[PDB]
């Protein structure tokens, strides 16, 4: 009637939980993390970069 399309798939369906942003959405292993959001909190999750 109003205020809803079919919203099931594509970038419009889903957003970053931390900052509410669709762009740059890391969905590997079911993160649902926007990249700007993901890199700074990556050490606190577990991810430690080397080589």
């Amino acid at each position: 009637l109003f205020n809803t399309r079919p919203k099931k798939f594509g970038p419009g369906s889903r957003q970053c939980r931390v900052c509410f942003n669709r762009h740059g959405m890391v969905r590997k292993y079911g993160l649902m993390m926007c990249r700007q959001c993901f890199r700074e909190r990556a050490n606190q999750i577990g991810f430690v970069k080397y080589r």
């Binding site: 205020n3 809803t4 939980r17 931390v18 509410f20």
Partner: protein, 94 residues
């Protein structure tokens, strides 16, 4: 969903907050009513937009999810509306 929440379902928000003393609501408007209390999710956001701006409840954000605490003057208000016996729910009690 949409429109003003019934006045029975106003007390459905308050009587949950009267017993437990916590109520957290997801920021999203189109999201399903919050797990726990069977109402629209917008109506929980509207009633605690209403509550915070007359003090009583202590709002605290992070993470879209809005983690409310209920103060000493807050438990006076609900009891009056609720009609609950005085000293009914101390947070000091376990």
């Amino acid at each position: 969903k949409f429109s003003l929440i019934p006045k029975a379902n106003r007390k459905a928000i308050y009587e949950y907050l009267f017993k437990e003393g916590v109520i957290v609501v997801q920021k999203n408007g189109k999201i399903e009513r919050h797990p726990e209390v069977p109402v629209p999710n917008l109506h929980v956001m509207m009633t605690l937009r209403s509550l915070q701006t007359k003090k009583f409840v202590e709002e605290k954000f992070n993470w879209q999810h809005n983690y409310y605490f209920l103060t000493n003057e807050g438990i006076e208000f609900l009891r009056t509306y609720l009609h609950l016996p005085p000293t009914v729910f101390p947070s000091t009690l376990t």
